[PDB]
Ligand binder design. Sequence first.
Ligand SMILES: Nc1ncnc2c1ncn2[C@@H]1O[C@H](COP(=O)(O)OP(=O)(O)O)[C@@H](O)[C@H]1O
Ligand SMILES: [Mg+2]
Length: 429
Amino acid sequence: DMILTEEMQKIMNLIQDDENNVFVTGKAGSGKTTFLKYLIEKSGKNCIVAAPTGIAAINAGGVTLHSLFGIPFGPITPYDRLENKFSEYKVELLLKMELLIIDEISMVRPDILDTIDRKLRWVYESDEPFGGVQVIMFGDLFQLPPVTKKQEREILSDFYDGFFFFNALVFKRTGFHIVELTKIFRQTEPEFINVLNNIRNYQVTSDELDLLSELKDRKISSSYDNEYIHICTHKADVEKINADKLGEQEIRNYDIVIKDKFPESSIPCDLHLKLRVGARVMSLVNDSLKGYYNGMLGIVTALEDNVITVRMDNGRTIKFERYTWSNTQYTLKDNEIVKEEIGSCTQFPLTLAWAITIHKSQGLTFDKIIIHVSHTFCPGQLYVALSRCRTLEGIVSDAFITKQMIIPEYALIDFERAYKSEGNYYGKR
DNA sequence: TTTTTT
Ligand SMILES: Nc1ncnc2c1ncn2[C@@H]1O[C@H](COP(=O)(O)OP(=O)(O)O)[C@@H](O)[C@H]1O
Ligand SMILES: [Mg+2]
């Protein structure tokens, strides 16, 4: 099935030595998130796959970085204390892992990598960066950046010159090679690739955007015989469209249950979970026993009182039960600080998958999509949504595509000049 | 106003 480009073998040779870290970039559809599936199948018996988002982790066969390394939400400064301790089952994992793969690195905060470094340096008991573990990063800096809430930026701008993964402070202590894939796969249309890559480079003309006028077509909603999908910029449109696609003339509501104090905004799951038979669903957590990792997709076969039966896209059937989330914070017992749980919520780890966010959709491939991008945005978000689909016809838009939707980021322009000046390499040598 | 733990 797969084709090995001259650059891919060239990339394969660079990582044959242990001491070289490599960042593999390329345009959307260049075959990077694919090529890493091909790399896993040779070197030693070691590798770990991970990504920032649960879905891109599924797309690469890995897990989330926060679940793998036990990273709490929010930035960790070098002065911040390490909150979570690895178990003995997890320590053997990281110790036996001789190679680390991070898919879709563009969405990774720089403090996360330094949290990876500090946790790897301690679990390996070594002063070498990342515990001396080889790291290979896949992603396109021109897709979209991480989050990057405003409260967390001013906090990180104390210790960090930039908010992008390469700004991490471990790159004072080490560095990485950069190789780009110049061949596109996902789209076979030459005129559609041209306008795509021009959306990516911020250099594009309104005569090329004329090609996207056909995306205003309302043509076919039908049918579920190979279906259709919605990708929205904001979670509110995803929330409405999923409920819009479920008429609720039929069936179930599943209510959450809260013990003690669990603030609304901090609740990870649905307060009232509404589902019918044949409803698109997404697994919200990781269970190795049942076998559903977070980010997987499925469809509801049956709805009972305490059990939901779902047939996943991978072909495996899972019976979902109620998952319990624990809310723990910092309080005072005795005289001392304590981690005690101040509340818990319980619901099924499922949510309606008909719609979705460009953020969650990054890395995915589709034959037919329905793009919702209105005039509301965040940088690089449009290039992602367009490039998900293989064909220009399969794309359906809510509104006309305008240059207003393009938000350039000039730090990526400077970063490209930097490493291309030295041997396609960034950081310390 | 977008994601993400043991
Ligand atoms: N070397 C390759 N050979 C054949 N098809 C490929 C190759 N690389 C990618 N593809 C195809 O391109 C599409 C998306 O691939 P993917 O690697 O996930 O995109 P990206 O490089 O932007 O992360 C898939 O349909 C895949 O089959
Ligand atoms: Mg990808």
